Amino acid sequence: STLEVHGATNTRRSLLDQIFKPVLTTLGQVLDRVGAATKKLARFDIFKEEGFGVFLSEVKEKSRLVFSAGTDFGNAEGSAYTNAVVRNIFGGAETLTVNASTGTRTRSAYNATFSTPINGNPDLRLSVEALRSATQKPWASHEEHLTGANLRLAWLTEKGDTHALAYSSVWRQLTGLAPTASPTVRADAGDSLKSSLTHTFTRDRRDNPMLPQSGYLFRSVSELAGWGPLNGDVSFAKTEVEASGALPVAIGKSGVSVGGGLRLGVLYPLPLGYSLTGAAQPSRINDRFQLGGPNDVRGFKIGGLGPHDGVDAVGGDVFAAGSVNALLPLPRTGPDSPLRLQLYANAGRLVALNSKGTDKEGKEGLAMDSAAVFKGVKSAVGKLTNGIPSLAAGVGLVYAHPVARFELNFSLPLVLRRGEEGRKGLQVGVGISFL
Amino acid sequence: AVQLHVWGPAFGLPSIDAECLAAIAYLAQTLGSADYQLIQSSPSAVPTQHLPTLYDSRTSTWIGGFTSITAHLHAASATADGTAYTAFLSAHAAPLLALSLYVSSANYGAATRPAYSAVLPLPLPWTEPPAVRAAMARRAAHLGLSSLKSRIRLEEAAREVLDVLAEVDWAAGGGGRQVAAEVRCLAFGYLALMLLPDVPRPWLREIMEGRYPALCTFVRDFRARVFPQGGKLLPWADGGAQASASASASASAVALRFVRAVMAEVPLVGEWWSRWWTARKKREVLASKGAKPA
């Protein structure tokens, strides 16, 4: 009836051609088509969110440069940034620039991101980042100066789940071992390239992203470092799975929402080209798994709960961590502000690799075939289920702010592995995704 | 026919840098009043960018540094110790100077800053004395001490050099070990700039005058012998001490020097310009020696 002529001031009609092309029984069809069209123009970024409306037949470009300061949150209590966005260049494209001094943990960043929509569909955001950082890691005393640049390809379909096919290539210089460090760190300082190819799936079906009540969050990650075509100097295969949850029971509709969590992961050292057998160098300290702190397993320091070399917490290949939430409401208040109570009993184990099965190799032991590392992983997972897990418990006063879930907990550890530095009460967590 | 390029005569010595001062003493001892010119200048006014610099008009050669100058114009234990002390003065004895007179604001800015200003053109003191202070502060590293009961460290870092230079018999007809005719001028220059200045905050003068009688006598004798009444009788340029910088006295030249010096200090495109300018000047210097670069 009425083809698209209005609002096409800045953007292209070729882009707006395919967003609602098939406008072709009379009572409510158009009433549903307009609802589909507005929800399609919503996941874009060009159109202005205020006047995103079109009258029944028979807005404008948002901006071009949008600076900001803000303060994001990345599990570190302090942050900062200064964006510089360009909401259109050719079609529905974009660019970006963050300079996140980020205060406490990291000390720099420069992310000259560049997104774009691909082939009409507004979800194939083929970003091309070019990053930089100098982050301080005080649990294993050193810094790390990443200088990478990746080519991501994401896709958010019509059911809430997402995807990713990033291709990163970093530099990973560990150049901060000034204080008393452990010789495991010294034996790892240097360089790397870590050209990888990951894939992140996440079916986020929860209601309150900072305070789940009735949903369930499956979220998998599957890294694959230098191997075969994609070369480099590190070679491994890393996976990680998470499955949160929450479900109310009964009393009004007062929030009870007993919930739980889970985390699995593996780190399988691989050979360095077009095979599955051959020499397989063990993993470095840049790739292993940390598990602890107020976010993933509460009751322990931000890097504890793992193989410890004294005062520095080196990682570990395989791990597993669970949780149980309570989320009881405030006394005689009701479904008011997000300040709610909480009870938890956090568990989780993390053990590293070892061979202990073949000594005939003698010289140059830093090389194993597939059988050796396979039996090593078998022994690791066998050691994972021999003994009581860490199992630390405590209470806290959640605060489901729209962006950050402040916790302010008080917990005590029950089962410890000698030399693991479990926290004892009065920790202040903050972040995006707890356990 | 040669023509030197040195600092200014500020302190009553023909220079304020032991290198060019020693070059002046050497030339005055070996050549004769009718051979050189002692053109006063500044580091940014010579292709070498290293101030003590010869210019032999017979073949148009630029020769930076003092050791390269004495390379031109030219038992065995004598010369062996000569080279040994020539190398031991150029390091651990120049950083003993720069521990004072160039790094400590309590001592730099009361006698050194006006001395530098009184030898430079009008707009240049904005930029070059900062460069020289940065240089002498870099050279004063590897010493652990900076601008400052934390005083014995000064005495130690001075003895660790004066005791090596002590048992040398720096100027006489007989004694411990006669060194050479050349390096004696270098030792004179360094010990003079270590003793003679007015130094409103002195800490080397007392140590030298109360511990090493040979050094004070050597410096005073060498000054009174070859440098009478401030060395004004030296064959300076045609006009005079201040009138020496006449070959680069045009306002255009000083403006170019100032604009180069300030352009080489911008945040990001400064390093590239500085590297390019240094490369071009070194190419010119090599082309002056009858060589062939790319």
Added chain:
Amino acid sequence: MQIPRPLQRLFDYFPLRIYEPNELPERSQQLTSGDLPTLYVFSTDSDARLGLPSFNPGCLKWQTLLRLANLDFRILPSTNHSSPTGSLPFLLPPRTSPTASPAPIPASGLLSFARDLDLGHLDADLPPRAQAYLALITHSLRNAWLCALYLDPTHDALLRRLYVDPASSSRAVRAALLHQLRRAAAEQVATASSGGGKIVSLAPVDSADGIDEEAVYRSARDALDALASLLRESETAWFFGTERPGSFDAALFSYTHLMVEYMSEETESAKGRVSLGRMVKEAGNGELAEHRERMLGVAWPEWDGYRR
């Protein structure tokens, strides 16, 4: 007004079952197991097993000093980022338990941990004339080594195969590592006035055009002649009439050995600049090469195959 911490005294006793330690990973049980003290130097991977000399004269000095001190230790390569200070040649005592290691021992206290009979000949106040030459080694020959290895396009292959090949194994990182190395070298050599003290804007002259490749080489040749002339007053094949070589002989050997080994090639011979190895072999009548070959008789007696 600072009062002590809470005194309720019931926070303890809560950790219920403290279990056994966590069995450190693979890459921390072969590289750090240890049976003897483990010196970290810039050595190769093959040379690290037999204890051959390194190719960094700042670490060859300490390795030679420790071998002369009748100490038994191991040698492992490293990358200069893992050190208590910025410089590499540090030592690590062996482990007392698989979850604890004593503090490292940096380059300034190696010959204090080495004490078995008389460790006095290796660190003592030199004669006042001795320092006049110990400054001839550390400031002229060092700048010669730098300006010859890093900032000389004829020695590009040697630098690229020693210092940046065992580092990353990636081209785009090898390039930046080579650039950082050459920048630091040009900055460190352009400070000693023997090479060049050119005055530019307030930033050290980190470029291959700040120094000149004439003065450094000439001062190196003069330093070698002076060192040979000092050695010819010895009468005991060691510098100061001493039976066993002390710190001075090791300090000279650190540069002499490497200059005879790596930068001692025969090419066109028309360039004029003779390789530092030839100058070592010709200083005087050969008085330095004989001293070097005598130093490999108190340090590496079981080794053979040097001179190249």
